[PDB]
Structure 1
Amino acid sequence: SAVGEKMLDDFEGVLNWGSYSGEGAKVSTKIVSGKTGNGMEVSYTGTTDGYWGTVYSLPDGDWSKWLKISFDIKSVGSANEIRFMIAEKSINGVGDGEHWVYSITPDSSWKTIEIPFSSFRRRLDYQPPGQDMSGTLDLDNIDSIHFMYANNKSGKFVVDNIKLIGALEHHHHHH
C-alpha cells in the first residue's frame, strides 16, 4: 500500500464536476469558499421518483495502492442525508459499472469524513447495465466518484479536499 495521501480535488483548479438529474429532481454546483481556499457547493431539489448527482469522471482508475477516500463536508438548511458513490468502469465500453455507496449527512460544521474502501456497500436501489455483478469493489477499475441523492428532500452542502488516504507511515516490517 501507499503511505500518505493523494489529492483528487482540492477545488482550487479545473472544474471537474458534471451534474445530472431526472424525473423533476435538480442539482446545480458552483465554486464557493471552502474548508481551505475554495470548495464546491452542491444545491439540490429531490423529488419522489427523481434522482440527482454530481460526478467527477477520473483520469486514473487504479486505486489499488490506497486504503480510504476522504473529503471535507458541511451543510450550508435542514440536515439531510446524501450518498457518496464510487462507480467502477463498465464491462461493455459504455456507461458505468458497479455502484458502491456510503451514506453521509452534512452538518453545520466542517467535518472530515474518511471512508475505508471496505466500508462501501454495494448499491441496492440501482445498478447500471454495464456492472460486473461481482459484488466486490474492484479498486483497479474505478470510473468516477459522485455526490448524489439519498431521498426525495432538498438541501445545500459544500465539499472540499477530496483525497485518497493510504497507510499512516512507512514502518519497519517484522521479518
Structure 2
Amino acid sequence: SAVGEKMLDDFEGVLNWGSYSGEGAKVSTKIVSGKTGNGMEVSYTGTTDGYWGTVYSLPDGDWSKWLKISFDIKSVGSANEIRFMIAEKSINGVGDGEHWVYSITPDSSWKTIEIPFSSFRRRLDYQPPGQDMSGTLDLDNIDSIHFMYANNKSGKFVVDNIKLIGALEH
C-alpha cells in the first residue's frame, strides 16, 4: 500500500460536482464555509418514487494503492440518512458501472468518517446497464464518487476534505 493520504477535494478550487434528479426530487449544491476554508453545501427534497445525487467524475480511476476514503460531514438542523457511493467504469463505453454504497447520517457536529474500501456494500436497489457484475469492488477501475439519496425525506448538509487514506507508516 501507499503511506499517508491523497486529497481528492478540499473545495478550495474547481467546482467538480454536478447534480442529477428525477420524478419530483431535487438537489442543489453551492460553496459555503466548510470544516477548513470552504466546503460544499447539499440541499435536497426527496420523493417516494424519485431520486437525487451529486457527482464527481474523477480524472484518475486507479485507487488500488490506498486503503480508505475519508471525508468531513455535518448537517445544517435535522438528522436524516444519506449514502456515499463509489462507481466503477462502464464495460460498454457509455454511462458508469457497478455501484458501491455506504450509509451515513450527518448530525449537528462535524464528523470525519473514514470508510475502508472493504466496508462498502454492493448497491441493492439499483445497478446501471454498464456494470461488470463482478460482486467485487475493482479499485483499479473507479469512475465516480457521489453523495446521494437514501429515503424520501428532505435535508441539508455540508462536506469537506474528501481524501484517500493509505497505511500509517512504511
Q: Same fold (TM over 0.5)?
A: yes
- 1:77 Cα deviation (Å)? 2.4
Q: Deviations over 1:64-121 (max 9, x none)?
A: 0000000000001220000000000000000000000000000000000000000000
RMSD over aligned CA atoms reads 1.1
- 1:17 Cα deviation (Å)? 0.1
Identity %: 100
Aligned equivalents of 1:77 and 1:21: distance in 2? 23
Aligned equivalents of 2:4 and 2:49: distance in 1? 41
Aligned equivalents of 2:134 and 2:125: distance in 1? 16
TM-score by length of 1: 0.96
Give structure 1 regions of 4+ aligned residues with deviation exceeding 3 angstroms. Answer: none
Aligned equivalents of 2:167 and 2:111: distance in 1? 21
Aligned equivalents of 2:116 and 2:64: distance in 1? 12
Gaps in structure 2 of 5+ consecutive residues: none
Matched residue SS, 2:31: strand
- 1:4 Cα deviation (Å)? 0.3
- Which structure: larger Rg? 1
Aligned equivalents of 1:129 and 1:52: distance in 2? 18
Gaps in structure 1 of 5+ consecutive residues: 170-174
Aligned equivalents of 1:137 and 1:26: distance in 2? 29
Aligned equivalents of 1:77 and 1:153: distance in 2? 14
TM-score by length of 2: 0.99
Matched residue SS, 1:118: helix
Residue 158 (structure 2) pairs with residue 158 (structure 1): yes
Matched residue SS, 2:15: coil
Aligned equivalents of 1:129 and 1:112: distance in 2? 33
Could you tell me which residue of structure 1 aligns to residue 5 of structure 2?
Answer: 5
For these two proteins, the number of residue pairs brought into alignment is 170
- 1:43 Cα deviation (Å)? 0.3
Aligned equivalents of 2:143 and 2:18: distance in 1? 14
